[PDB]
Short mmCIF file of C-alpha atoms in Angstrom, two decimals:
data_model
loop_
_atom_site.label_atom_id
_atom_site.label_comp_id
_atom_site.label_asym_id
_atom_site.label_seq_id
_atom_site.Cartn_x
_atom_site.Cartn_y
_atom_site.Cartn_z
CA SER A 1 -55.08 252.44 -5.95
CA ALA A 2 -52.66 249.53 -6.36
CA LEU A 3 -50.06 252.03 -7.57
CA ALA A 4 -50.29 253.83 -4.22
CA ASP A 5 -49.67 250.54 -2.41
CA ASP A 6 -46.75 249.64 -4.68
CA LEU A 7 -45.14 253.06 -4.27
CA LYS A 8 -45.61 253.01 -0.49
CA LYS A 9 -43.83 249.66 -0.28
CA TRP A 10 -40.97 250.65 -2.59
CA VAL A 11 -40.56 254.10 -1.03
CA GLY A 12 -40.32 252.45 2.39
CA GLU A 13 -37.75 249.95 1.12
CA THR A 14 -35.73 252.81 -0.39
CA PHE A 15 -35.66 254.75 2.88
CA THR A 16 -34.96 251.70 5.06
CA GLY A 17 -32.68 249.64 2.82
CA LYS A 18 -28.91 249.55 3.23
CA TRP A 19 -26.91 251.16 0.43
CA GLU A 20 -24.37 249.31 -1.71
CA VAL A 21 -21.68 251.58 -3.15
CA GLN A 22 -18.64 250.97 -5.35
CA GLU A 23 -15.99 253.57 -6.15
CA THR A 24 -15.16 254.22 -9.78
CA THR A 25 -13.46 256.80 -11.98
CA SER A 26 -15.51 256.71 -15.20
CA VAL A 27 -19.19 257.37 -15.78
CA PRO A 28 -20.86 253.96 -15.34
CA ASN A 29 -22.83 252.19 -17.98
CA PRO A 30 -26.42 252.01 -16.66
CA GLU A 31 -26.29 248.20 -16.68
CA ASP A 32 -23.53 248.46 -14.05
CA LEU A 33 -26.20 249.48 -11.51
CA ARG A 34 -29.38 247.89 -10.18
CA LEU A 35 -32.47 249.78 -11.35
CA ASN A 36 -34.57 251.46 -8.63
CA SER A 37 -32.37 250.10 -5.86
CA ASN A 38 -30.11 251.49 -3.13
CA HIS A 39 -27.06 250.90 -5.32
CA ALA A 40 -24.67 253.68 -6.29
CA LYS A 41 -21.31 254.39 -7.86
CA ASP A 42 -19.06 256.90 -6.07
CA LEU A 43 -16.86 259.12 -8.27
CA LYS A 44 -14.38 260.92 -6.01
CA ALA A 45 -13.84 263.62 -8.65
CA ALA A 46 -15.99 264.33 -11.69
CA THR A 47 -16.50 267.51 -13.70
CA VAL A 48 -20.05 268.51 -14.63
CA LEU A 49 -20.76 270.78 -17.60
CA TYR A 50 -24.17 272.18 -18.49
CA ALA A 51 -24.78 274.06 -21.73
CA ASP A 52 -27.97 276.11 -21.78
CA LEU A 53 -29.69 278.17 -24.45
CA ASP A 54 -30.73 281.54 -23.00
CA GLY A 55 -33.61 283.81 -23.95
CA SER A 56 -35.87 280.90 -24.88
CA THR A 57 -39.12 282.53 -23.70
CA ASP A 58 -38.40 285.66 -25.75
CA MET A 59 -37.55 283.55 -28.80
CA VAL A 60 -40.37 281.00 -28.56
CA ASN A 61 -42.98 283.71 -27.85
CA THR A 62 -42.10 286.12 -30.64
CA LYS A 63 -40.39 284.10 -33.38
CA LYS A 64 -41.81 281.88 -36.08
CA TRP A 65 -41.60 278.28 -34.90
CA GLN A 66 -39.31 277.42 -37.81
CA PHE A 67 -36.74 279.94 -36.60
CA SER A 68 -36.94 278.82 -32.97
CA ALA A 69 -36.64 275.17 -34.05
CA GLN A 70 -33.51 275.93 -36.08
CA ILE A 71 -31.90 277.78 -33.14
CA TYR A 72 -32.61 274.91 -30.74
CA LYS A 73 -31.41 272.31 -33.23
CA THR A 74 -28.19 274.07 -34.20
CA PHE A 75 -27.22 275.02 -30.65
CA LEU A 76 -27.95 271.57 -29.28
CA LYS A 77 -26.15 269.74 -32.09
CA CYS A 78 -23.08 271.98 -31.93
CA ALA A 79 -22.93 271.74 -28.14
CA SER A 80 -23.41 267.97 -28.03
CA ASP A 81 -20.99 267.28 -30.90
CA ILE A 82 -18.31 269.39 -29.19
CA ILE A 83 -18.93 267.75 -25.81
CA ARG A 84 -18.50 264.34 -27.44
CA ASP A 85 -15.40 265.50 -29.32
CA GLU A 86 -13.82 266.52 -25.99
CA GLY A 87 -14.65 263.15 -24.46
CA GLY A 88 -17.56 264.25 -22.31
CA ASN A 89 -20.36 261.82 -21.52
CA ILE A 90 -23.76 263.38 -22.19
CA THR A 91 -25.91 262.41 -19.21
CA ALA A 92 -29.11 264.45 -19.57
CA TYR A 93 -31.11 266.53 -22.03
CA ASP A 94 -34.12 268.74 -21.33
CA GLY A 95 -35.39 271.61 -23.46
CA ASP A 96 -32.75 274.35 -23.41
CA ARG A 97 -30.14 272.33 -21.57
CA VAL A 98 -27.54 269.56 -22.06
CA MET A 99 -25.63 267.97 -19.18
CA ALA A 100 -22.30 266.19 -19.49
CA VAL A 101 -19.81 264.59 -17.11
CA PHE A 102 -16.05 264.58 -17.78
CA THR A 103 -13.65 262.22 -16.01
CA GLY A 104 -9.97 261.36 -16.16
CA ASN A 105 -6.72 263.21 -15.68
CA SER A 106 -7.57 266.15 -17.99
CA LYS A 107 -11.28 266.47 -17.15
CA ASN A 108 -11.15 270.13 -16.10
CA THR A 109 -9.04 271.35 -19.02
CA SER A 110 -11.19 269.29 -21.41
CA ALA A 111 -14.46 270.63 -20.00
CA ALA A 112 -13.24 274.23 -20.07
CA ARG A 113 -11.91 273.93 -23.62
CA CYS A 114 -15.27 272.37 -24.52
CA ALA A 115 -17.09 275.40 -23.11
CA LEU A 116 -14.87 277.86 -24.98
CA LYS A 117 -15.36 275.84 -28.18
CA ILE A 118 -19.13 276.00 -27.68
CA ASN A 119 -18.84 279.79 -27.49
CA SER A 120 -16.92 279.71 -30.79
CA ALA A 121 -19.58 277.50 -32.36
CA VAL A 122 -22.25 280.00 -31.30
CA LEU A 123 -20.39 283.14 -32.35
CA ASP A 124 -18.46 281.83 -35.37
CA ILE A 125 -20.77 279.18 -36.86
CA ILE A 126 -24.38 279.64 -35.78
CA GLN A 127 -24.58 283.43 -35.43
CA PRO A 128 -23.24 284.19 -38.96
CA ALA A 129 -25.68 281.66 -40.40
CA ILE A 130 -28.47 283.42 -38.46
CA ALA A 131 -27.69 286.87 -39.84
CA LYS A 132 -27.22 285.56 -43.38
CA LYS A 133 -30.22 283.27 -43.94
CA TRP A 134 -32.90 285.10 -41.90
CA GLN A 135 -31.60 288.72 -42.25
CA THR A 136 -32.09 289.37 -38.54
CA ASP A 137 -30.41 291.16 -35.63
CA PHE A 138 -31.31 288.32 -33.25
CA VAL A 139 -28.34 287.37 -31.06
CA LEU A 140 -28.07 283.80 -29.79
CA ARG A 141 -27.34 283.86 -26.05
CA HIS A 142 -26.19 280.83 -24.07
CA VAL A 143 -24.28 279.88 -20.93
CA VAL A 144 -21.96 276.96 -20.15
CA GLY A 145 -21.39 276.33 -16.44
CA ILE A 146 -18.81 273.95 -14.96
CA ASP A 147 -18.00 272.61 -11.49
CA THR A 148 -16.01 269.63 -10.21
CA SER A 149 -16.67 267.57 -7.09
CA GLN A 150 -17.41 264.13 -5.75
CA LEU A 151 -20.56 262.67 -7.29
CA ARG A 152 -22.62 259.58 -6.59
CA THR A 153 -24.95 258.11 -9.19
CA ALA A 154 -27.85 255.66 -9.18
CA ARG A 155 -29.92 254.10 -11.97
CA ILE A 156 -33.54 255.22 -12.32
CA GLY A 157 -36.33 254.78 -14.84
CA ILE A 158 -37.74 258.05 -16.14
CA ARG A 159 -37.34 258.17 -19.92
CA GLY A 160 -36.45 254.49 -19.79
CA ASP A 161 -34.76 251.89 -17.65
CA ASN A 162 -31.27 253.37 -18.23
CA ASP A 163 -31.37 256.85 -16.69
CA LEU A 164 -28.80 258.04 -14.17
CA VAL A 165 -29.35 260.54 -11.35
CA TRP A 166 -26.33 262.46 -10.06
CA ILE A 167 -25.95 263.44 -6.39
CA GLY A 168 -23.22 265.91 -5.51
CA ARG A 169 -22.14 269.52 -5.49
CA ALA A 170 -21.00 269.81 -9.10
CA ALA A 171 -24.32 268.56 -10.49
CA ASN A 172 -26.13 271.36 -8.69
CA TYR A 173 -23.56 274.17 -8.92
CA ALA A 174 -22.85 273.77 -12.62
CA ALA A 175 -26.60 274.05 -13.26
CA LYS A 176 -26.93 277.13 -11.04
CA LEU A 177 -24.06 278.81 -12.90
CA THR A 178 -25.88 278.40 -16.22
CA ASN A 179 -28.90 280.18 -14.72
CA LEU A 180 -26.83 283.37 -14.44
CA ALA A 181 -26.81 285.90 -17.26
CA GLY A 182 -24.13 287.90 -18.98
CA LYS A 183 -21.21 285.49 -19.51
CA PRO A 184 -21.04 282.58 -21.99
CA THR A 185 -18.78 280.49 -19.71
CA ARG A 186 -18.65 280.33 -15.90
CA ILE A 187 -16.57 277.88 -13.86
CA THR A 188 -15.87 277.40 -10.19
CA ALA A 189 -12.41 277.98 -8.74
CA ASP A 190 -12.02 274.21 -8.33
CA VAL A 191 -12.15 273.94 -12.13
CA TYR A 192 -10.00 277.02 -12.79
CA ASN A 193 -7.28 275.88 -10.37
CA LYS A 194 -6.82 272.63 -12.34
CA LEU A 195 -6.64 274.24 -15.79
CA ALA A 196 -3.50 273.92 -17.85
CA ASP A 197 -1.83 277.26 -18.58
CA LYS A 198 -2.94 277.15 -22.23
CA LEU A 199 -6.54 277.28 -21.01
CA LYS A 200 -5.89 280.35 -18.82
CA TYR A 201 -3.60 282.72 -20.73
CA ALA A 202 -3.26 283.65 -24.40
CA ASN A 203 -0.80 286.17 -25.88
CA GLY A 204 -0.07 287.38 -22.34
CA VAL A 205 -3.76 288.11 -21.68
CA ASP A 206 -6.03 286.54 -19.07
CA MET A 207 -8.77 284.45 -20.63
CA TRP A 208 -10.78 284.48 -17.38
CA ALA A 209 -12.05 287.07 -14.92
CA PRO A 210 -12.59 286.30 -11.21
CA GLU A 211 -16.02 286.78 -9.67
CA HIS A 212 -16.76 285.79 -6.10
CA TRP A 213 -19.89 283.67 -5.70
CA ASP A 214 -21.08 285.24 -2.46
CA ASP A 215 -24.01 282.82 -2.03
CA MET A 216 -21.79 279.73 -2.20
CA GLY A 217 -18.71 281.12 -0.47
CA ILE A 218 -16.36 280.22 -3.35
CA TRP A 219 -14.66 282.02 -6.20
CA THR A 220 -15.77 281.55 -9.79
CA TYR A 221 -14.22 282.61 -13.09
CA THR A 222 -16.00 283.85 -16.20
CA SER A 223 -14.87 284.02 -19.81
CA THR A 224 -16.04 285.43 -23.11
CA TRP A 225 -13.20 283.63 -24.90
CA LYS A 226 -13.94 281.63 -28.04
CA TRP A 227 -11.72 278.63 -28.84
CA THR A 228 -11.66 277.63 -32.50
CA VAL A 229 -13.54 274.40 -33.19
CA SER B 1 -11.13 270.08 -38.36
CA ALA B 2 -13.68 267.55 -39.56
CA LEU B 3 -15.87 268.79 -36.72
CA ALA B 4 -15.89 272.49 -37.61
CA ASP B 5 -16.34 271.72 -41.32
CA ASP B 6 -19.22 269.32 -40.66
CA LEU B 7 -20.91 271.75 -38.28
CA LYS B 8 -20.61 274.69 -40.68
CA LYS B 9 -22.12 272.66 -43.53
CA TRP B 10 -24.93 271.15 -41.46
CA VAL B 11 -25.76 274.43 -39.70
CA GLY B 12 -25.99 276.17 -43.06
CA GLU B 13 -28.26 273.49 -44.48
CA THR B 14 -30.43 273.67 -41.36
CA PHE B 15 -31.02 277.40 -41.79
CA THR B 16 -31.52 277.22 -45.58
CA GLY B 17 -33.59 274.04 -45.96
CA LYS B 18 -37.37 274.26 -46.07
CA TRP B 19 -39.28 272.37 -43.40
CA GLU B 20 -41.25 269.20 -44.07
CA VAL B 21 -44.11 269.01 -41.57
CA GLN B 22 -46.88 266.50 -40.89
CA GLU B 23 -49.69 266.84 -38.37
CA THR B 24 -50.07 264.19 -35.69
CA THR B 25 -52.43 263.69 -32.76
CA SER B 26 -50.13 261.73 -30.43
CA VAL B 27 -46.56 262.04 -29.20
CA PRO B 28 -44.48 260.62 -32.09
CA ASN B 29 -42.03 257.81 -31.86
CA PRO B 30 -38.59 259.39 -32.39
CA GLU B 31 -38.38 257.04 -35.41
CA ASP B 32 -41.32 258.91 -37.00
CA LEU B 33 -38.86 261.73 -37.73
CA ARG B 34 -35.64 262.17 -39.68
CA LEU B 35 -32.67 262.75 -37.39
CA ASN B 36 -30.97 266.17 -37.53
CA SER B 37 -33.19 267.28 -40.41
CA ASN B 38 -35.76 270.00 -41.06
CA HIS B 39 -38.57 267.52 -40.47
CA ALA B 40 -41.20 268.20 -37.82
CA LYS B 41 -44.45 266.83 -36.48
CA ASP B 42 -47.16 269.37 -35.68
CA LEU B 43 -49.32 268.60 -32.63
CA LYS B 44 -52.19 271.06 -32.86
CA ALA B 45 -53.08 270.60 -29.18
CA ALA B 46 -50.85 269.19 -26.46
CA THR B 47 -50.54 269.55 -22.70
CA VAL B 48 -47.08 269.79 -21.13
CA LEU B 49 -46.45 268.88 -17.51
CA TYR B 50 -43.17 269.49 -15.68
CA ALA B 51 -42.46 268.16 -12.20
CA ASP B 52 -39.39 269.17 -10.22
CA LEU B 53 -37.93 269.40 -6.75
CA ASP B 54 -37.51 272.80 -5.11
CA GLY B 55 -34.33 273.39 -3.13
CA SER B 56 -32.25 270.35 -4.11
CA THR B 57 -28.99 272.33 -4.10
CA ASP B 58 -29.17 273.23 -0.41
CA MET B 59 -30.31 269.71 0.46
CA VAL B 60 -27.40 268.11 -1.40
CA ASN B 61 -25.00 270.55 0.27
CA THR B 62 -26.26 269.93 3.81
CA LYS B 63 -27.80 266.45 4.12
CA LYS B 64 -26.23 263.00 4.05
CA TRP B 65 -25.83 261.84 0.47
CA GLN B 66 -28.04 258.82 1.21
CA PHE B 67 -30.84 261.21 2.19
CA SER B 68 -30.50 263.35 -0.94
CA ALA B 69 -30.34 260.24 -3.13
CA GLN B 70 -33.48 258.87 -1.47
CA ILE B 71 -35.33 262.16 -1.99
CA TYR B 72 -34.38 262.33 -5.67
CA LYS B 73 -35.12 258.66 -6.30
CA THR B 74 -38.47 258.54 -4.52
CA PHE B 75 -39.75 261.82 -5.96
CA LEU B 76 -38.70 260.92 -9.50
CA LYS B 77 -40.09 257.38 -9.38
CA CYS B 78 -43.39 258.54 -7.85
CA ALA B 79 -43.76 261.38 -10.35
CA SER B 80 -42.82 259.30 -13.39
CA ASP B 81 -44.96 256.32 -12.36
CA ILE B 82 -47.96 258.61 -11.81
CA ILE B 83 -47.40 260.39 -15.14
CA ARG B 84 -47.31 257.06 -16.98
CA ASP B 85 -50.34 255.84 -15.01
CA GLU B 86 -52.31 258.88 -16.24
CA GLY B 87 -51.33 258.17 -19.85
CA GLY B 88 -48.67 260.84 -20.18
CA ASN B 89 -45.54 260.36 -22.27
CA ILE B 90 -42.29 261.22 -20.52
CA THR B 91 -40.34 263.36 -22.96
CA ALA B 92 -37.37 264.65 -20.93
CA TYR B 93 -35.46 264.01 -17.71
CA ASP B 94 -32.73 266.12 -16.11
CA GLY B 95 -31.61 265.93 -12.49
CA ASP B 96 -34.61 266.76 -10.33
CA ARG B 97 -37.01 267.51 -13.20
CA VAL B 98 -39.32 265.43 -15.41
CA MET B 99 -41.20 266.57 -18.51
CA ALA B 100 -44.27 264.86 -19.96
CA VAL B 101 -46.69 265.49 -22.83
CA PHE B 102 -50.38 264.54 -22.67
CA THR B 103 -52.62 264.26 -25.73
CA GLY B 104 -56.24 263.34 -26.41
CA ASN B 105 -59.70 264.41 -25.37
CA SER B 106 -58.96 264.39 -21.62
CA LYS B 107 -55.36 265.64 -21.71
CA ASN B 108 -55.88 268.67 -19.44
CA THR B 109 -57.95 266.83 -16.84
CA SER B 110 -55.47 263.93 -16.85
CA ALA B 111 -52.46 266.24 -16.47
CA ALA B 112 -54.09 268.18 -13.63
CA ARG B 113 -55.16 265.01 -11.83
CA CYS B 114 -51.60 263.76 -12.34
CA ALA B 115 -50.29 266.91 -10.61
CA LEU B 116 -52.64 266.52 -7.64
CA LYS B 117 -51.68 262.84 -7.33
CA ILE B 118 -48.00 263.85 -7.32
CA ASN B 119 -48.78 266.19 -4.43
CA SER B 120 -50.41 263.26 -2.62
CA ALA B 121 -47.38 261.06 -3.31
CA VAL B 122 -45.17 263.73 -1.75
CA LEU B 123 -47.34 264.54 1.26
CA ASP B 124 -48.87 261.12 1.97
CA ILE B 125 -46.16 258.68 0.83
CA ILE B 126 -42.70 260.24 0.73
CA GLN B 127 -43.00 262.72 3.60
CA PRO B 128 -44.17 260.10 6.16
CA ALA B 129 -41.30 257.87 5.00
CA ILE B 130 -38.87 260.73 5.63
CA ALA B 131 -40.36 261.19 9.09
CA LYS B 132 -40.22 257.48 9.90
CA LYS B 133 -36.66 256.78 8.74
CA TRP B 134 -34.89 260.08 9.36
CA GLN B 135 -37.00 261.49 12.24
CA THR B 136 -36.78 265.03 10.88
CA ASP B 137 -39.13 267.86 9.94
CA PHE B 138 -37.34 268.48 6.64
CA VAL B 139 -40.06 269.20 4.08
CA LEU B 140 -39.84 267.86 0.55
CA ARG B 141 -40.78 270.85 -1.62
CA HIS B 142 -41.81 270.34 -5.24
CA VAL B 143 -43.74 272.06 -8.04
CA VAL B 144 -45.76 270.70 -10.95
CA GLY B 145 -46.49 273.18 -13.74
CA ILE B 146 -48.87 272.64 -16.66
CA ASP B 147 -49.64 274.54 -19.87
CA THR B 148 -51.36 273.59 -23.12
CA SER B 149 -50.64 274.77 -26.68
CA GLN B 150 -49.73 273.71 -30.17
CA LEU B 151 -46.26 272.17 -30.33
CA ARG B 152 -43.88 271.17 -33.08
CA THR B 153 -41.26 268.50 -32.48
CA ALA B 154 -38.08 267.45 -34.28
CA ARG B 155 -35.64 264.61 -33.67
CA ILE B 156 -32.17 265.45 -32.35
CA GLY B 157 -29.13 263.50 -31.19
CA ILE B 158 -28.13 264.55 -27.68
CA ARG B 159 -28.19 261.60 -25.28
CA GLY B 160 -28.71 259.31 -28.26
CA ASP B 161 -30.28 259.17 -31.69
CA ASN B 162 -33.85 259.29 -30.29
CA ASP B 163 -34.22 262.67 -28.56
CA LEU B 164 -37.07 265.05 -29.36
CA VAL B 165 -37.04 268.82 -29.00
CA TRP B 166 -40.39 270.51 -28.37
CA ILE B 167 -41.14 273.96 -29.79
CA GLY B 168 -44.13 275.91 -28.53
CA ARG B 169 -45.58 277.92 -25.69
CA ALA B 170 -46.53 275.04 -23.41
CA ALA B 171 -43.04 273.53 -23.45
CA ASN B 172 -41.61 276.85 -22.28
CA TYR B 173 -44.33 278.03 -19.88
CA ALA B 174 -44.80 274.74 -18.04
CA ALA B 175 -41.08 274.74 -17.27
CA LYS B 176 -41.19 278.39 -16.16
CA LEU B 177 -44.11 277.70 -13.81
CA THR B 178 -42.02 275.05 -12.04
CA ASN B 179 -39.26 277.60 -11.40
CA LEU B 180 -41.69 279.44 -9.11
CA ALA B 181 -41.92 278.55 -5.42
CA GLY B 182 -44.71 278.46 -2.88
CA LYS B 183 -47.34 276.24 -4.56
CA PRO B 184 -47.23 272.52 -5.40
CA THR B 185 -49.35 272.77 -8.58
CA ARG B 186 -49.62 275.65 -11.06
CA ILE B 187 -51.58 275.58 -14.33
CA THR B 188 -52.28 278.21 -16.95
CA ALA B 189 -55.78 279.52 -17.58
CA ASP B 190 -55.92 277.55 -20.84
CA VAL B 191 -55.53 274.33 -18.84
CA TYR B 192 -58.01 275.40 -16.16
CA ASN B 193 -60.64 276.31 -18.77
CA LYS B 194 -60.56 272.72 -20.11
CA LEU B 195 -60.74 270.84 -16.80
CA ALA B 196 -63.70 268.59 -16.10
CA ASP B 197 -65.80 269.76 -13.16
CA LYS B 198 -64.49 266.94 -10.95
CA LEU B 199 -61.00 268.46 -11.28
CA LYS B 200 -62.20 272.01 -10.52
CA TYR B 201 -64.58 271.65 -7.57
CA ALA B 202 -64.90 269.35 -4.56
CA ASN B 203 -68.15 269.43 -2.57
CA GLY B 204 -68.95 272.70 -4.31
CA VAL B 205 -65.74 274.52 -3.28
CA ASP B 206 -63.02 275.60 -5.69
CA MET B 207 -59.84 273.56 -5.62
CA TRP B 208 -57.98 276.30 -7.51
CA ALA B 209 -57.07 279.91 -6.78
CA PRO B 210 -56.53 282.42 -9.62
CA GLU B 211 -53.15 284.13 -9.71
CA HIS B 212 -52.23 286.55 -12.47
CA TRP B 213 -48.77 285.82 -13.90
CA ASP B 214 -47.81 289.47 -14.33
CA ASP B 215 -44.60 288.53 -16.15
CA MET B 216 -46.25 286.41 -18.87
CA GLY B 217 -49.39 288.52 -18.94
CA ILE B 218 -51.70 285.52 -18.48
CA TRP B 219 -53.84 284.14 -15.71
CA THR B 220 -52.79 280.98 -13.89
CA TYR B 221 -54.45 278.82 -11.27
CA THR B 222 -52.76 277.23 -8.27
CA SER B 223 -53.80 274.37 -6.01
CA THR B 224 -52.69 272.95 -2.68
CA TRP B 225 -55.07 270.01 -3.06
CA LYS B 226 -54.11 266.37 -3.41
CA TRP B 227 -55.70 263.38 -5.10
CA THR B 228 -55.43 259.73 -4.12
CA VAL B 229 -52.72 257.92 -6.09
#
């Protein structure tokens, strides 16, 4: 069809066309980039956080839709409100998962504190409301994963003309970390090694445990800490 | 803080408030719903399609950034353009993954034809462009997964004030199908059983192979076929 011809032409132009790239520190506004063009912004260091609700199949399959809807809504609102409060830019949303990018001179400490605050919101705000209003033993499980790296971004048109796609290690690794079970927060060593001391130690106790990510050849750090919102 | 106080109050109201629900036959405008409220639309029958890349992490880690950006951009534009062309409504975007909802009397046939067209876009449009520009045998791997079920939706504020969360089997299962590797299109039995004959057979031969999804305890159907865009 005509769509096939249009896509063939544009796909060819995308593979053959020269790229135009500008370096920047902050997440761009979508209007800073040409839509569906070989135009990108290059962020030399940016910190990606994903916050993911776990156990969704279990929950959706067995629970009344009203309960599942309330879990999704409360987790996603708490997570997104806390991300915004810590200065993160929310860049994607899909189902169980929120993506944010942090920039600036405290991006790693901010992102990590954000993750620990999300754990507090789950354990200290949502969970007690769950046990009290529905009289259930259901436990809300979630993971926040964080990495930091160079990222490039281009403007695409999926939900609308203002979407951004992110190309770089942290966009992939932070997402992979949230796919792992058992710890509410996981960060790469590149994040941990930039944390202020108040984000690493409390009352003489380590807030993080090291865990080597054998597949990626880097260290990571996990935490069950909850930071009061 | 204002944040913790506001979250505690709103979370409590979200668990205690009764739901207001109206039935609808199409994907709602986000404005059809009250933001951050126990207000839902009930879609008695909907078909969910997810389309994603397979193996983007290793690609990003090993290929030139221009190559990865071209793969993401061309896959996502092809998939989203084909979804919209088949009358689907794009409901989520994150990284290498697109979600759409199809409604109406031909929703399953349209979604399945959409999936086979996406396979054609990959094999007949994008892959030859990879070969021509980059002169490489790197294979773009992708999966499209499809399920159909009742869904409820509510309006949330993640990227902006107009996000929708989708609650129901098809939103969960279609995403889970796309986490599996080895086949470009996977649909549940409930989708297969609604397909028009022209989407099931070609010259009297089956275009689909049955595969029991031992984890979910349901039958699925897979296809390696493609359909002209």
